[PDB]
Symmetry: D2
Subunit: 296 residues, 4 copies
Amino acid sequence: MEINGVEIEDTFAEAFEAKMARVLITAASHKWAMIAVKEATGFGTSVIMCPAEAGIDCGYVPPEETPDGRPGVTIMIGHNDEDELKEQLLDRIGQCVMTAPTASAFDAMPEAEKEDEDRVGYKLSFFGDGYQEEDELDGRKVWKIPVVEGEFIVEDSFGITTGVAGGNFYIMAESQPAGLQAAEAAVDAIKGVEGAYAPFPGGIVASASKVGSKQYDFLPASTNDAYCPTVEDNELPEGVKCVYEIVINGLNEEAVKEAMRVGIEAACQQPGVVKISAGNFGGKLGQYEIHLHDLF
Amino acid sequence: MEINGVEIEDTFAEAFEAKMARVLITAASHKWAMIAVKEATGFGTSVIMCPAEAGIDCGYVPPEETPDGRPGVTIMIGHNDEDELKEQLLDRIGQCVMTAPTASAFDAMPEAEKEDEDRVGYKLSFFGDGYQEEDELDGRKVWKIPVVEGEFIVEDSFGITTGVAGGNFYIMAESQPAGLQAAEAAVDAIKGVEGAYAPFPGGIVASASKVGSKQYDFLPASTNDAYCPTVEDNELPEGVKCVYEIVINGLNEEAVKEAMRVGIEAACQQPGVVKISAGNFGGKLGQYEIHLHDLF
Amino acid sequence: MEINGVEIEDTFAEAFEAKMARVLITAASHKWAMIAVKEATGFGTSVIMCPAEAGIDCGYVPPEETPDGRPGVTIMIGHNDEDELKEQLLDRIGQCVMTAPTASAFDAMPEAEKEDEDRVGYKLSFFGDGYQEEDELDGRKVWKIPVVEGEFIVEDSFGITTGVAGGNFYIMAESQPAGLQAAEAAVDAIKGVEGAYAPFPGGIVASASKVGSKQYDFLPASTNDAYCPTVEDNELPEGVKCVYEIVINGLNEEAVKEAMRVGIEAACQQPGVVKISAGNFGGKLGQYEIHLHDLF
Amino acid sequence: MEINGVEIEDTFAEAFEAKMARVLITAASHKWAMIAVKEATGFGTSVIMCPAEAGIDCGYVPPEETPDGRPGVTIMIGHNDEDELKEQLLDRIGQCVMTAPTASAFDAMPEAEKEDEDRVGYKLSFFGDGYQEEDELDGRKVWKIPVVEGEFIVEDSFGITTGVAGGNFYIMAESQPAGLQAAEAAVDAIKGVEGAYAPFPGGIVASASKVGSKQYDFLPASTNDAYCPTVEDNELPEGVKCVYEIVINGLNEEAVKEAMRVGIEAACQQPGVVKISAGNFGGKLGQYEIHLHDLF
Ligand SMILES: [K+]
Ligand SMILES: [K+]
Ligand SMILES: [K+]
Ligand SMILES: [K+]
Ligand SMILES: [K+]
Ligand SMILES: [K+]
Ligand SMILES: [K+]
Ligand SMILES: [K+]
Ligand SMILES: [K+]
Ligand SMILES: [K+]
Ligand SMILES: [K+]
Ligand SMILES: [K+]
Ligand SMILES: [K+]
Ligand SMILES: [K+]
Ligand SMILES: [K+]
Ligand SMILES: [K+]
Ligand SMILES: [K+]
């Protein structure tokens, strides 16, 4: 039950079925690709009060492996509801990728994961006001939409899948600096797992939540008081002054598990880490249960 | 008029009254401040189909000049509707700053611009499930909200103002590479103008719009066919193959003007620029008219 | 030969045998690895008036794949003279990696490429003033050097090879902006080639030189006036207003050839590029001659 | 004395007269300026085994405040020996700024600080092989050097001053993570002090040194074993598990004093810091003796 002297709690992450898209953004450079990505995946940490859960999947797609031969970056966007996801593909590609210097948007759902199809390009194509043209680029059906820069290229349809949302683990540490050094290291690890993304700022949740509110009636979620170090009768080990949660969404359960696995291993290499836990709902809500003890 | 041999079109930018907040994010470092900022100001280029218009104002606030003595970054968030703006202050601070490692949120509306108040901190404080405390930090009324990291510090209320939204200018260039080298240079200039921000990806709009559609009944906006270089149907000078728009929102008209002014100057120093224009609605819609000829 | 409408001159790059080292830098995060790496590889464009030629090879080495299980980046350092190379290893590891927060230095010269060994770790260990300690980390012989931060971990020996310096190609474009947009795409592509690096700023040479000088007997090298657009008597196509050179060094000839290949391909997808060429010295001096037509 | 609960040792930093140059690098964007700057200032932590001590002074010089109206960043380069300094100016401007896309080099040594001149531009201009033009740019004497990109603009002469090298303080923390969190905050603060730079990686020395060596006659510096947490006989408080040094060089004593001041204050706001100290050589060698208590 230890990884590098760090206790691994015998518990599980409780994750959920969720609708996800996966989008390849290319641009003139990695720099401009990331400009579009950040804007497009921003305001998207959690569907508690964001319109989606979004983030970067692969930060560097080689020019030679993109449809247009340009630098690319894959992102994922998810939602529990499929239509809100479709609305969110339109909004973020339409408002944040279409408007971003030089950037184009292609589907990047693997064929194996494809379940539904959304014609985002087509719906976006009407922006060209009669002047939009369909074409074929590297075997893809795309729309060339006239814009002041020149043209916006967007694939006709995007693959939608049922993914796994809310995979997670907690880093419990001797202090805030130590928990954050460990959490950034975990996230550096999760970066390399294809099919997985971490929607929170830097991948990291500094304010994990519990379903609903004890004192109040109107709140959907509230602080996880059990793991809050400034709260007097909390459920934290001795020597733990800071908790961080890494939350992971993925194309499938195996990607989420891999992300959790390599995330925890990386964290446990950084000093001042006391214990690794995970957040669940007692199996009463999720569709998935990733037991930390099974990953190693 | 010419600036460095670049024709300055004798026209105007038509800007609007808009509700704006201005928020100081501090964090343990400039790095983590920016992690929170990007997430919080992302998906926020335009209210056509984003929930807000958001972006960075001052990217470096010295530790010495913040309430808590930590590295800070000011951002602005705006909307035409004040209540959607209040909802957006809650949503972005609550979901993207509260959850971001180490980051705190303070008001940064100058007293001169303050018109309304919104008690975002207080409304956020209920997340603490009875465990939230009020306090005074550097003469500010804050809420210390217990979170797994330790505490989230957020100011009680945030100043809301009526700002100027939609200031702008177009860079018309001999090519796309040249228009973008000029636009990034403009944006580097606009960065230094306090009270102003550029909500589009990199500050830059590659797909400027017009009100409505000539062809379709279901479009709030569509592409500006008049300034589209591939639309062989258009109002662009000869030698112009690419157009970029820089759109600027500010606390007041004088900030938007200063941003426009130093933006155009910086653009006109970069090669391949043919003409500087601006977008308006014939004075039939806006509340402001910034004549390019008056700035110089 | 044409690539995306871009002419590929039937010429060759002429490259040279050069002594080379390759180093894996790990650290608590990719941020701090990059801090050490940028410092260790800067002032390292050319052996003309720099002390070495140095640059990043692989920018993200996953935590799982490093000896200490931490985020890594590999860099390469080269010199035509082996003695000077060993001194540059010691200087750059000792002054830039040892001194950098959390960074360790491990050997990353492939076994196939190794010809000689340089006991940089052993030579650095004397900094410990008696308190240094030899140890095994992951089957590697390292020195644990006590430092005020804690420890500096450095592998005992680093493998040196005879690699290839001076692979190149020129990008000839309609404008400076177009040239640099193409060149950066090139570099993003080259980034992804393992065992190759581009030592110049951003990978790119804004000021390629020719051997000797037409006016100054005392100068060994001067501006390549043949490719200078502002010289009236240049050998440039009409319509070429900018030339950039990409220079590539690598562990072997194949890595350099691969870098030129993917770099050229990437450049030719960017708008405003007229011609791709390459530099040589008549095929007489160099040990390697890489004909552009043989790449595609 | 205490700052936010952190003890401030009643000791002093002992600093030295050092020759210094200050250079304004402009380029087509802040991005490209930073590319040139990072290359020009790298391999420049300490004159112990680097060829200079170099670093960024001001990271964001607005377009309107530069001679060419482009984005700027200032850097400082220093050496204890003036002749080696002039050589490092020529080497780093010539190999790292001249070669870097879009970058120009202008003098940024304040008039008040100027003692001597170094005609770096004049010396570089011979690269133009007869095609170089002297010219005036906003009242400055520059050389327009033809290069394959277009032109390299470099000011004829650069001002040298006798500045201050070696200002410092130590951060003594409860852990490495806490030490480095405090140290980075420090550096963000120091970033904002004009005329001061921190030459080490990220501004930070993970491996502070002392004059000479106990065991080894060939070493001019070796580990500061008294502040090594893993050295059995150390002079560290119990409860100090990590020490970092911040080393500051500047144009004058005030800039260095100011940097130490704002840097210390910033550090002490970060959690897990026990003590702030500083390094000196008894007050016998150095020309400046900066007492920490005199700062606050
Ligand atoms: K676009
Ligand atoms: K699936
Ligand atoms: K990933
Ligand atoms: K996100
Ligand atoms: K302070
Ligand atoms: K926070
Ligand atoms: K106002
Ligand atoms: K601004
Ligand atoms: K934005
Ligand atoms: K180190
Ligand atoms: K080899
Ligand atoms: K590479
Ligand atoms: K380099
Ligand atoms: K500074
Ligand atoms: K240059
Ligand atoms: K001075
Ligand atoms: K440096």
